[PDB]
Amino acid sequence: NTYGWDIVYGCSNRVVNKHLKNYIDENKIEFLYSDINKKQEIKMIFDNWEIINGGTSNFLRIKIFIKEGYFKFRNTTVDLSGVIPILEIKLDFFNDASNPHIKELKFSFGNKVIVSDLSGKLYEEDEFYFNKLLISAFINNEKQVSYIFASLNVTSNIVWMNPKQFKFVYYSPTDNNDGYLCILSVVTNRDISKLSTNVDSSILSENSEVGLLISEKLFMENLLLPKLSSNMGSNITSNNFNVINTSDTTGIIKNKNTLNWYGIKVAALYYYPEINDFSMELFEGNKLKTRLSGIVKLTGYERIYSKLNMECITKFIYDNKNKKVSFEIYSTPIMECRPIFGLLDGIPAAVAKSVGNWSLKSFRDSLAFELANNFTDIINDIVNWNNLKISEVTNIILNVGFCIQGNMN
Fold first, then answer.
1. How many domains does one find in the chain?
2. CA-CA distance, 167 to 184, in Å (whole number)?
3. Peptide bond into 131 cis (omega under 30)
């Protein structure tokens, strides 16, 4: 699903364009420049700006609607009322003067980083070498446009999501409509470059304005494990578990050491089985394949035990009404209970079979739980597009990556 990145955020241009429009409908947006004494000047008054496709890398490409204005070179007069230039511009992150741990995504015309694609439509004269030279005297008014495309929060209450390195990229598809987006690596200072910038269009959907894609690893470590590792009795606590790397984004859950199961009462006695090696890897996109093995000693016959082997597939489950993530039992392709005894003593062998079969059930049963995260909290945790929270989460998908989707209000 993802592309070698750790957490990817994304937003509809259809969304930001609109918050852009009434940031402009605030109306204090006139641009003046006069080159002296080169006899040049423009006064541009803006109707609307509109982000469009064609944006490559850091850059946005945007349609500029002028509805009042002028422009003079060498005693030549041209009123810019209605001309519609098309620019490409750079965005970069700007640290904040309030909370510096909140980095802020704004326009940036430093020093160079504005290109003119089309000059105007279509009320112009070909002789527009001067308009372009001059409207790149945009820069003088860089500070005037302080629009916040997204707030990005390092040092949030959710620590595993905190980004160390991260950068902006615009996704334009093959069909026309699009969403731009922001890519990160959390905590880890990995190679970073060269990583791709290609993004999964899956992140957004027809129903959803904002999307968030969590890598498989982060999901395993910070979403599944925390629940699982506390679903198995008081002598198991995730400190008992490792998550092992297979890629820098692909990961398997193995046990760090012996897992001490809680006590099961069979007939008159309590038994305390122990799983010795444990494995949970992600399988067929949305299912978990669990593969454990261990034993259970017979209390009172210490040196007579039952060897326990299970394979058990569980499945992701999403409840769109209460926004709950769930895993249920899909199959139990292996539940093998094989008592170890010799000759005559069939009588313990039989309780060994029975404690074995009870223990296996206990195991499986623990693989069927419901996570407790607040996913609304999660999507809103690091990136808030346009300095805004998301009201409703529209879908959650586990297809190798872990994807949360929603609408802002």
1. 2
2. 7
3. no
Are 308 and 259 in a shared domain?
Answer: yes
Q: Please state, as a whole number, how many other Cβ atoms lie within 10 Å of the Cβ of residue 104.
A: 19
One-letter identity of residue 173:
P
**Alpha-carbon torsion 92, 95, 96, 99, what sign?**
positive
Resolution in units of Å: 2.8
CB within 8 A of 321, min separation 6: which ones? none
d(CA 408, CA 261): 44
Can you tell me whether residue 134 is helix, strand or coil? helix
Q: Method of determination?
A: X-ray
- C-alpha 264/C-alpha 360 separation (Å) is 11
Quote the CA–CA distance of 285 and 83 in Å, as a whole number: 50
Range(s) of the domain holding residue 43? 1-214+374-409
Q: Please check whether residues 146 and 266 belong to one and the same domain.
A: no
Reference 331, options 316, 315, 313, 317; nearest CA is 313
- State the Cα–Cα distance between residues 47 and 55, nearest whole angstrom: 22
Record the tokens describing residue 3, joined without a space: 């592309």
Q: Is 254 helix (H, G, I), strand (E, B) or coil?
A: strand
Residue 204 shares a structural domain with residue 228: no
Q: Is residue 196 domain-shared with residue 301, that is, in the same domain?
A: no
